[model samples]
Each structure stands twice: as C-alpha cells, then as structure tokens.
Target chain A: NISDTALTNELIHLLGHSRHDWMNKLQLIKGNLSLQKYDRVFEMIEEMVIDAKHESKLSNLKTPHLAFDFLTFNWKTHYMTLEYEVLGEIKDLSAYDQKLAKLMRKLFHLFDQAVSRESENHLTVSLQTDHPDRQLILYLDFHGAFADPSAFDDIVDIMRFEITSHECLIEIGLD
Target chain B: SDTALTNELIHLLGHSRHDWMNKLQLIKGNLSLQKYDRVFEMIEEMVIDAKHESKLSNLKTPHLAFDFLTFNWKTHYMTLEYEVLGEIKDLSAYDQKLAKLMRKLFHLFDQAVSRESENHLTVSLQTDHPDRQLILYLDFHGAFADPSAFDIMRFEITSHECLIEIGL
Candidate 1:
C-alpha cells in the first residue's frame, strides 16, 4: 500500500503531465498558425475537443481505477499506444471496475509481450453500454505485426479474439 | 483514506481537464473572431502558466504542494493563485507540517471571509536568497475577517492582507 504523502505526490506528477499535454497542444496550434496553416489549426482544436469529450465520458463511468489505467496507459514507456472512445450514454460500471481493471492489465501485458518490437502498434478500445439488452460491449482494435498469434489463446475464453498477420480484434461482452 | 483519495483523484483530474478545455475555448473563440493576435497571446500565456505549474510541482513538499494545486477547486469563498520564484529548495522533512499549517489557514480564512466580497488570495514562494531562507507570502486582496498562526512560520494579518513569512 502506498503512503498518503506518496499518493499525493503521484497525483501531483499526474497533474504535471496533464498540464504538459496542454502545453504541447498549444504549441502545435501556435506553430500551425505561424505557418499560415489555419485549416490545421482548427482541425487540432476539434480533435482536442473530441478527445476531451471522450475523457469526460470515461471519467463518469464510476470506475476510477479502470479509468485511470486507460488515462495513463500511454504515458508510460510501452510498445503499443492506447486510445478509447465511449459510445452512447455511460452507465455506472463500478460493479465491473475490479474485473475490468484486471482484464485490461492482463491484455496490456500480453500484447506487450506478443506484439513485434520493430513495428508500430496502436490499440483503440471502444466502450458501449446497452441498457435495453443489459450488456456492456468493449472492442479492442489492434493494428500491428504479432510475434506470436497463439500467445492470446489464454485470453480467448474471456474475449472473442480474432487475429491475422497484421491486425487483431478482440470483443468482450459483460452481462 | 481510500475514499478520500478517490474523491481527490476525481476532483483533481476533472478540475484539470475543465481548465484545459477553458483554455482551448479561449483560443477557439479568438480564432473564430478573426483575432489571430489574441490567439497567439493566449498560446504564450498558457506556456507561462505551464512553467509556473512545473515550478510549483518541483517544490519538495508534496502535501503542501497538493493543497496549492487544488485549493481553487475546493474553495468557494476565494480564488487562490500562487507563484514559485527562483530556485526551489527542498522542504521534504516539513511537508506534512507545512500542509497542516496551510489547511488551518485556509479553514480560518474560509470562515472569516465574506462570499460576496470578490475574495482573492495569492501565495508567493521565494526560495532564492543568500541565506537560503525559504519564504512565503500569502496576500489576500479582498475581505479578511478577524481570523488567525504556526510556530515554524511567521504571519502578519491585517483587515485586507496577510504576510506569511517562513524561514526554512
């Protein structure tokens, strides 16, 4: 368990990083404006707005640990990058928080070991909740070369895993 | 502690994200209004803001630093602003003590001050000096009530302002 003071420090470090990201976005807008690329400037702003919307939605899921993992996944040194989109209205998924966190962490570790080190790997997770059907749907779209496709066999029972030479799609349903 | 930590984590993240959106909107507003110069200035201002935040985070007192970072978000009576000047000195040993002292002052000020008075509090950290004495000045420009101090620090309070000088 982390001490209180240490946890406070961790939060401060996270804030520092979030602030740094804002600075980088501003820098891009400024550079593009200076270069007379007004189209790109507006495009960057739109993208930021959409990303912020997604972040707000993700944070409202009532799953702090799970939200946090997706929030800071790309911040760490990793071979694969992560991005997520929340579709439709979000529900309180606190019941699944522990399960989801563990699942995502396991997949992260597995993908890290299974994906090729020499190629670019990007993972996009889509979260959608359907109250009418009483189900939570998750889609993990991965694009890259895999070192070993069978390495994912261990998780196939937990998710509908499909793999090819250059792409993999994993769909999970929670009822 | 666990519940408090979760609440704080959510608040900090939400507050930071909201602040970022406001900043981006400022740029967007200026751009749509065809005021390119203002957009550039907004960009420059954000850079300076980031620099100040980095300095604030660099202070060795994590607990005290966390208070500063989230004070504005948690307080309703007054808006808190702070700046860290010059080189930062380590205050690791006094982290909890300083943080506790700050909370005491914040609570007192919150109770003493009026909500409709447009309250503003600014904390200035001065760490660069020949004696290497770390000093802090808490200046309030709005209404200050008949409020109160710590042993490790010195506080001079008036009706409209306060000077908290700490020699560390």
Candidate 2:
C-alpha cells in the first residue's frame, strides 16, 4: 500500500521510461529518413497502424479480461483464429466477472484435446446481451470435432455442470 | 490537483490512454526539426535503457515496490550505472514486505551519501540464501567526506535481514 504522493512519483518515473522508448523509436525513423530511406519509414508506419487497429478491437470488448485471456491462449496454443462477435448493446464488466474467463479457458483447453490432427477443427465465441431482461448469453462454437466419439459426453457434462454451478444458463443449438 | 486526478495518477502505469496522442505529437515535432542533435535530446528524455527496464520487470517484489526503488535514482543521485552480483528470485506474499523494507533503506543510503560524490560512487546489488535476502552495497571510489554517517547505518543494521553497506 503506497500513498498518493508515492504512487504519482513512481508513475512519473515510469512515464519517463515510456517516453524514452518511443523517443528512441522516433530516432530510428529519423536515422532511416536521413539516408533517403523513405520506403523504410513508410513500412514502419504501416505496421504501427495495423497494431493500433488491433489494440482498438481489444479495447472494445465488454469483458476485457476474458477476451484477453481467450485470445492470448489462442495465440499461445497456435490455433488458427477465433472470430469474436458481439450482438446489439452491452454493459461494462467488473473484476468479479473474471471467474467466467478462467472457466471459459479451461473449457477451451478441453476442446483443444479433442481436436484431431486430420480434422484440425476451428472455434468462435459470440456474445449476446439483453439489457431489458438483464441477461447475458455467451455462445461458443464447437466448429465440429473428429478426435473420437468416445469421452465426448463426459467432456460436455463437465462444462455444463460448472457453468450451471455459477448460476449461468447453458444451451446447445443445431439445425 | 484534485483527489480524483491523484487517484487516477496512482495506478496510471504511465501508459494512460492519453499517451498515444501525446506520443504522436512528439513524433511530429521531432521530424519537423530534421536534425540528429534535437532528436537525440528529446528521445533521451523519455526512454529508459533496455537493461534497467528488464531488471525492474523481473524484480521479485510487486510493481509498486520495484517502482519506488527505481523512481528516485533515475531522477536523482544515481541512474549512472550499477552491478548486480546475484540472481533475485520471485517473491511470495511474505517477501513483499521485505522488498518494501529494502526500499526505505535504499532511500536512507541515498540520503547519507554526498551528492557531490556521485561521479565516483557506484551502486551494487548483492543477494543471499537464493531465496531470502537482498543486499545493496555502495562503493565509494576515493571521494569521502565524513564516512561515519554511512558506516553507522551499516553497523546499526548489521549483517542480518538485508544488508545496506557503504564503503570502499
């Protein structure tokens, strides 16, 4: 526990560091530009722009921690990608909402084990919320599986029980 | 200067949402100057070196603790260069208090050393037990005026808990 004064002083110091790092990056750009390396400067700026757009998407999530963990785990596991879609409107989240993120990751890992080499299945997570009813529904796509029919029901039961224990509603849909 | 801003400032992490826009402004200003001298000075003011940043990042204690240890030196008497003689491990819940304890002692050591001697004085890092203690040794290279103040603190604490020693 630090005092306000102490914390501010520390942040000021940290800001100095961040300020220096970006400044150094600017220096590199200048170094290239000086040698008439105009193409290099343009290339760097293009990459930075893409990175900014990605961060903007990350910031838009209503449940940042869960989304952050899900995407991070996806990358760490070398999955192709998980299309994230949110429907209509949504409310902000609190730290208490983080338990859902951990459970969701564990569920995904279970799904990972069942993904066979030949099929190489894919997955996506979608979020839908109804403010009038005070209900939030999160949808995760299995995207199909072919590891084996064995042990699949047991896998589904574990996630279902855990989700219900948290007072969250769970459902499956097929057409 | 209100309580709200101060509260926000406490946990700002320096990369507050405002940083990106400000960074853009800085870059535009630098490129317009079109001179290496101006660019270097401006860049030097904002960025920390890679090594120091790593030491802080991998520090055993909490962020606040690590931030406090570094905040002053970069601005004040130190920031020159230093040596770490041992590996510092990750800290447990109990270890945090110990890290905080070390920060205050470092401050005292900072106060005791003469500001004029900084050109000759260098900071040192030493740890023990592979898990228990951290020591910061101050090596004074010839510039010594009234060394007793530092020597007294060195002995007052003795070779226990964590050591803060000042000498040749």
Candidate 3:
C-alpha cells in the first residue's frame, strides 16, 4: 500500500525475527535433547504446543476464519487491554481443548458485540481453576464488572447442566 | 482465498504488528537480562494466545504425545506428577483419544473441587504395557471436603484401540 521500502524491510525483519526466535527455541529444545536432558525436552514439548495449533487455526483452519480474528480485531477496535489468561502451559487441543477454544471465541465475540454498545471496555477471557473440585473454569468478565451480564445470559447457557457459578459467573464445558 | 490473504496483509501491517513487536521485545528483554524464569513462564502463558498475530509464521505440533495430556493441568492450575517408565512412543495418535477422555473426567472433577473445597488434583499416566494396556492414573492430590468428590472417578477408563482397561 504505502510505497515504503524501509517499512517493508522492517516488516520482513520482524518476520525474520519471529522465525529466528522459534529457531532459537528449536535449538534450545535440540540442545536439551542432545544433552539427554529429556526432562527439559519433555517440558518444552509439553509446553507451547497449544500456540502451534492456534497459529494454525488462525491461518485458514477454521470456518468463521475470524474465529481467530475476533480477539485481535477487538484490540483497539474499541479500547483498553483485553487480556486472555490461562494457568500453566497450554498444549495442542485434542477435542476438549478445541471445545474450550471454540467457546472462548464465541464468548469473546458476544462480549465484543455487547461492548460495542458501551464505551467502557475491559472485558476479557480468563481461564484457570478454582477451589475444591479443581474444575477448570473460564471467567468472562470485564475487569471488576461484566459489561453486559444479561448479554451473556442469552448467548450461552451455563446453567443448562447444573452449573455452579459465583455472582452469576464462570463456565465449564462438556462432562 | 486471495482476499483473505489481502485482509490478512492489512491486518498484520498495523497496530497489531506493533503490539506483537512489543511482546517480542518483552521476551527479548527478559532473555537479555537472564531472567529465564520470566521467559519460560511467559512462553507458557503466551502459548494459549493465537489471535495476536496479524499473519502466520510457523505452526507445528509438539514432538511428543504426552504434551497434550498435560495441557489441562497447566491450564487449570492443577498439580500433576507424571512418569514415563519405558520408551516414550509417538503417542500423538494414541493421546488423541486419551487426552479427550482425561479432560472430560478432569472437567467433572474440576467442578467437583468447588463443591468439596479441593486444593489440587494429581494425575499419573504412563505406558508400561506395550501391546497389553497403558495405565492412566488420575487422582485428587490435595484438599477435598468430602471423599465422595473423587468417588465419581471410579468409572473405568480404557483405551479405544486396545479396548483394554487403563487401571492398573
């Protein structure tokens, strides 16, 4: 678009840097494997596998295509740091992981639509475990207050299967 | 498809790329400072984020199969201790089903934790029997109000291919 060669090189350089970063990680993983530090290798393999899938999914691997686009599109499209947090290392989705990913996109999109109604935006996706049963939980709240709580009630039915929530929050998928 | 690529190009050339560059810089800063802990932790945390990039670079699966199984433990903050006594086979195809079974059960147990006040969940899945069957040991590690919260896990787990019980 802009006939900027410097900007073009900057873009290519960033791409090269991204590739270089992963290559270094590959070397780390390779070096660890070579050292027979299978533990480190195991940890590395066990970690960051999920991003591999997400990166793939974002690039023509899904229906909405924007399934991956929803999050990035929302950033600065309105306002604030919309964070997505999850505990521990995320690995590639089997089936349940895919389900969780799908629900998250759907939820984020719904929240985005709701937030478009108001100017204040901090709604984000937070996934982690809570007390006791140690059930994996997904929290879709806008910082302190959920931007449009009822907007969510119609979107997804968390209470369909005896779901327990705090302050009408939190979500779980499948069995 | 070409239009998608055009849209993608448009997407990557702007603020999103700037933000990604910011993230990459953060990683570079932490690495240059020898703050490896922060780097590794960020790597794990950032692994779940895919919507950040405007265009794609490299995409691939983990080298081993066990990685998929531990995903839940990492994502849910569940405490896990696992062992691979024998050869670590390419269990990707194998783990395809196993990971699904494990997550469903873990999800149920996860919800149960809230009702029972459980602090942590313990999981141990290994391949001891080559042609026979593998053991997928799942248990609650810490802080449960009632023992019944774990009783639901009593259901037998088995391999889809071998049709053999995973309980040892």
Candidate 4:
C-alpha cells in the first residue's frame, strides 16, 4: 500500500532512530558503570538485555517478510528455503551480539553482491564458534537450482572476500 | 665438618655459577643481535635459566647452623642425578611469603639430611614432584662429587637461602 519513496524514507528513519537510541543507552550504561554505581548499572543492563531480545525478534520477523515477498513476486517457478544455524554457547550475550551484528552486516553485503549478479537460488548460512574465546566460523551453502553454477561460485567468492574483511576488522579491534 | 660434604657442595656451586654466567652471556649476545623481534623471547629464556640455576645453588648450603639435637629430622633418601632443562622465571615476586615458607621448609630438609649417618644419606630437589610450588626430592649418595653421585640437595638448599638473603 506504500509508495516506493515513502517505504525508503521509513526504512532510513527506522535505522537512524535505532542507531541513535542504541548509542545513547549504551553511553548512559557505560557512564554509570565507570562511576561504580553498580545498582543503577545493573538495572540499565537488564533493560538493555530485554531491549536487545525484542530487537532480535523484530529483525527475525523483518528478514522472513522480505524473503517471502521476494520468493512470491520475483521467482514463482523456483522454490527457495533459507536456512540459518547459529551454534555456540551464548553465555556472553553482549559480546556475541556485537560480533553477530557486524557479521550480519557483512552477510547483507554478500547478498547485495549476489543480487547485483541476478542470481536467485537456495542458500544456507551457518555461524559457528569452535573456540568461543578465539575464533568464529561462518559457512554459506548455496545450490544453483535456478541460476548457473558459475554465478553461485561468484557470489561465494564475494562472500569470502567480505568475510575476510570482517575478520581483519576484528583483528584491528583486538590490537 | 666432613671434607667430602664440603667439597661436594662447592663443586655443585661452581657448576651452577658457570651455568648462570653462560646464561648472562647468551642474554648479552642476544641484546647485541639488533633483532628486536626475538629479544623478548631471548630475555625470557635467560631469566628462567638464571632462576633455575640460582635455585640449584641455593639448595646446596645450610641456612641455620646445625646442632645434632636442636632439629626435628625426617629424611627420604634417594639415588638420583638431575640434569637441568629449560629454566623458568623467578616467580618469587608473585609469592614472596610462599618462597619464604619454602626456605623454612628446606631448613628442615637440611637438618634431616645432616642427622643421617655419614656416607649413607643423600638429599636433592625432586623436580618431578607434582607440587611445583615447593621443591621436593632427596639425595641418597653419601659421597660428594662421586661423578655418579652429585650432592644436588645440599647445593639447592644453600642456593635457595642465598637467593632469599639477596631478595631474589
């Protein structure tokens, strides 16, 4: 029911608002913790956890909605199912969330590269942490059910390049 | 009071001193190599060697002047010769009190060894003990510097006490 221009404006506004709110809340919590006012800090952390959980659920909803529409309107003959698997102990949720957000951004860029190539097929993404303290593994499996195998290979190459760039970012952050 | 015991202790001390001097030489050489990348590794190794050799020398001497009846002695004597391997850093900074306590413990060890029959009891640090925090072991060879029988225990005990005095 919305116009393309309106939809684009809404998306931009939503993203900006989310980023602003996240930064503001994080700064407040960090300021309190640094002052050693642990009770207020703890309360802020609890609220942040709840907010993060809610935001994650919203993201899940948005991704599926986009996938459903893309399948229905763009490709009627070929059926595609996107499978995502997350494997690790999620004890340190905040640390994991930060890394996961960065990873997901890189993944979106991979999909952007694939779309630019006009390749549509089945895709599987997996995030695994073999050593939670040290390294994370990301796997993307795709079947060229509706596109050429070379196209799938090209997308995979782009994904690898993007993932390596992400890893370099992590290393620089650590250093 | 025995000539053999004194000679054995002195020989072990000389060997340990030689070992320490060699480590210092290595450290000096590495410093002049101009390879900053490998300097830290070399320095760490030198520190470790210095500590181990120092401990070996410390164990060879008695801290308190010996009296036959003033000490309570329990001795476990064994026939063994130890070859020093890789050295570790002097962790005395991390556990000063523990190191002091270990010195007190070694005093008891020396007293025990001294009380045993001459030429029958030997003592040395037991490097294989699961308790790395405390040195353990005994020498059973009564002869000093027998080539087959080095007085490692006496040498290590003396070295430990000396290191404590120097605040190592």
Candidate 2: residue pairs that collide: A19-B46, A20-B46, A20-B47, A21-B47
- Model 2 Cα shift for residue A157 (angstroms): 19
| Decreasing TM-score order of the candidates | 1, 2, 3, 4
On residues B1-168, what C-alpha lDDT tens digit does candidate 4 reach at each position? 222332322233233334434443453354356443454465455444334434443332222111110112223332223222223323334343433454454444444443333423212333344435334333343423222211122343331121111111
Which segments of candidate 3 are over 4 A away from where they belong?
Answer: A1-71, A75-81, A116-118, A129-135, A144-149, A155-168, A173-175, B1-168
Measured against the true two-chain complex, the DockQ scores of the candidates, in the order shown, are 0.50, 0.08, 0.02, 0.00
lDDT of 3 by residue, A19-76 (tens): 4445556557546644656456546644545443343333322323333343444432
What local lDDT score does residue A37 receive in model 4, on the 0 to 100 scale?
A: 61
Interface RMSD of 1: 3.2
Quality of model 4 by C-alpha lDDT: 0.36
Ranking by DockQ: 1, 2, 3, 4
Q: Give me the iRMSD of candidate 3, please.
A: 13.9
Per-model RMSD to reference: 3.3, 12.5, 21.2, 27.3
Candidate 4 on A103-171: residue-level lDDT in tens? 455544454444323334555554444453544555666543322223224431122432221121111
| Candidate 1: stretches off by over 4 Å | A1-3, A153-160, B1-8, B143-168
Model 1 chain A weakest 10-residue run by lDDT: A153-162
CA lDDT, candidate 1, residue A47: 93
For model 3, what is the alpha-carbon lDDT of residue A69? 41
Looking at model 3 chain A, report the run of 10 residues with the lowest lDDT sum: A159-168
**Model 2: residues >4 Å from true position, as ranges?**
A1-64, A67-75, A80-91, A95-175, B1-48, B56-65, B68-98, B105-168
